[PDB]
Design an enzyme around this catalytic site. Structure first.
Site, PDB file in Angstrom:
ATOM      1  N   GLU A  71      41.797  33.009  51.378  1.00 24.24           N
ATOM      2  CA  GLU A  71      42.720  31.967  51.790  1.00 24.24           C
ATOM      3  C   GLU A  71      43.067  32.095  53.262  1.00 24.24           C
ATOM      4  OE1 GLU A  71      46.921  32.441  51.010  1.00 24.24           O
ATOM      5  OE2 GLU A  71      46.473  34.078  49.624  1.00 24.24           O
ATOM      6  N   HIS A 100      52.716  25.721  48.100  1.00 25.76           N
ATOM      7  CA  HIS A 100      52.677  27.159  47.844  1.00 25.76           C
ATOM      8  C   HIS A 100      51.972  27.538  46.543  1.00 25.76           C
ATOM      9  CE1 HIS A 100      54.894  31.249  48.318  1.00 25.76           C
ATOM     10  NE2 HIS A 100      53.951  31.138  49.236  1.00 25.76           N
TER      11      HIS A 100
END
Lengths: 108, 90
Positions: A71, A100
């Site tokens: 990520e 998130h």
């Protein structure tokens, strides 16, 4: 600096690596980064956290033996980290999240 | 020296557990309340050193359908990688 969803996604697909404005959490720590301090931009101007392994523990992203996910922070400039992330696999599938990790959108 | 306490017998759901952690660990307002979000917060937001006191663990494990274990796992994995976290299972 390239830190937008499309810019980073295109870069990942084309060069198979993140743009130069990215550094892992450990590298940032070595530069003096302290998450609770929100001093990333102070110790590493123009850099964003990115490139770390994403476990995909909850299996929301396409899981397959051999495929590893990583990520990177998106839309980060300075201060505390935001809720935007780009997720890319070893075979270059690219997803994003702006909440998130609650929900993901495949973009490549 | 951050401190966090979880009263397991008061946890009535996985979301109950995440809301508790959000408070106890001063997590971001956008906290995702999922494992990826927790891992992200523990490795890129939370203050250290940290002491997590998880009371009545088993009780919380029952009301979260083992989800309590997956949450503990994240804490343990963060420590395994260097996060200065002391976990107290009472």
């Amino acid at each position: 600096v390239i830190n937008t969803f499309d810019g980073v996604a295109d870069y990942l697909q084309t060069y198979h690596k993140l743009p130069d404005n990215y550094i892992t959490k450990s590298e940032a720590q070595a530069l003096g980064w302290v998450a609770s301090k929100g001093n990333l931009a102070d110790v590493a101007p123009g850099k964003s956290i990115g490139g770390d392994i994403f476990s995909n523990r909850e299996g929301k992203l396409p899981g397959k033996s051999g495929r590893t996910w990583r990520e990177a922070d998106i839309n980060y400039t300075s201060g505390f980290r935001n809720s935007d992330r780009i997720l890319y696999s070893s075979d270059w599938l690219i997803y994003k999240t702006t909440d998130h990790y609650q929900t993901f959108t495949k973009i490549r | 020296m951050k401190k966090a306490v979880i009263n397991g017998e008061q946890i009535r759901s996985i979301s109950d557990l995440h809301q508790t952690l959000k408070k106890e660990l001063a997590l971001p307002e956008y906290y995702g309340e999922n494992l990826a979000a927790l891992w992200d917060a523990l490795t890129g937001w939370v203050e250290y050193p940290l002491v997590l006191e998880w009371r009545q663990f088993e009780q919380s494990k029952q009301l979260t359908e083992n989800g309590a274990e997956s949450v503990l796992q994240v804490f343990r994995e963060a420590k395994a990688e260097g996060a200065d976290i002391t976990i107290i299972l009472s």
